[PDB]
Amino acid sequence: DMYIERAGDITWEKDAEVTGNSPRLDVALDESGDFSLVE
């Protein structure tokens, strides 16, 4: 039995931690909703 619990408001935060890169990837999406890399 699944249940939900509130975790916060949805708002943009100024001075949030800025991280992560921006990779451009060739991908395929199958009928089961799974992404895979195309190489």
Which residues contact another protein by CB under 8 A? 1-13, 16-29, 31-33, 35-37
Residue 1 CB, nearest approach to another protein (Å): 6
Residue 29 CB, nearest approach to another protein (Å): 6
Residue 28 CB, nearest approach to another protein (Å): 7
In degrees, rounded to 5, the angle at the alpha carbon of residue 22 between the alpha carbons of residues 34 and 29 is: 15
In degrees, rounded to 5, the angle at the alpha carbon of residue 32 between the alpha carbons of residues 24 and 37 is: 25
Measured distance CA(26)–CA(35) in Å, rounded:
10
